[PDB]
């Protein structure tokens, strides 16, 4: 029906067919992501005898994805029990913060490795290519500071919203208002998408015009740059387009009738799982590749 949130008249339902498809999806995600991220972190922690900036950034990406998919199982249980998150108040804040901060970190580090590749390919002699490991550590800590600085507001709020008989633990909710959460999601998709697309296009154009693509290994690198672009789009475009659609019908129509939302809600959360695929799809493209 129509619920109520302070200063925000919201309406989010508990429709079925969300506990039969989403829990198995999240189970597969957690299994594969935990396995891949553990087998990736094993090399970095123990049997990697070198480092440098690019491996620093890949290690940070793996750390972010690892924390994300260890955060997954509680969210999986929350989906299983049909929005009945019966853990408390601190667990809600922690899980929402973990999910959002780790997604921001994954996206920011994807963008930064794309920019690193763009500098390494189009401007090989730029001073940013020759960057010290301490400088890389400072830059990565600064990036983590930027990531956290936009997300601590999920710790101040009372996340476990009690309504009717249920305890909602969802940061993504639809309300007749604009908050920094939705806007941050919008830029989270758009601006890194623009940077990644520009970097990939410039890399491809410079490599092809240099006519060095004839090498049997450059072709694999090009196809994996393309692959990383397409997987980024595949995991991030659906949820964002559903958010744009719900913004459109919220602006045009409003919240007078709450029954024009059901569909645009349900698939939304399903699309919301697509980005978690990135966590379980990053190891195959980023680390396990490039022999
Ligand atoms: O941040 C997320 O991905 C999220 C937020 C609320 C509910 N489910 C997932």
Residue numbers in the entry: 9 to 299
Please share excerpts from the published article on this structure.
The ligand binding pocket lies deeply buried within the HCAR2 structure, surrounded by TM2, TM3 and TM7, with ECL2 acting as a lid for the orthosteric binding site. A distinct hairpin loop at the HCAR2 N-terminus and extra-cellular loop 2 (ECL2) completely enclose the ligand.
Niacin forms a hydrogen bond with the side-chain of Y872.64 through its nitrogen atom within the ring. Other interactions between HCAR2 and the small molecule ligands include hydrophobic contact with L832.60, L1073.32, S17845.51, L2807.39 and Y2847.43; F180ECL2 and (to a lesser extent) F2777.36 form stacking interactions with the ligands. The side-chain of N862.63 lies about 5 Å from bound niacin, and makes a hydrogen bond with the carbonyl of C177ECL2. The presence of P168ECL2 and a beta hairpin loop further reduce the flexibility of ECL2. These structural features isolate the ligand binding pocket of HCAR2 from external solvent, unlike most class A GPCRs.
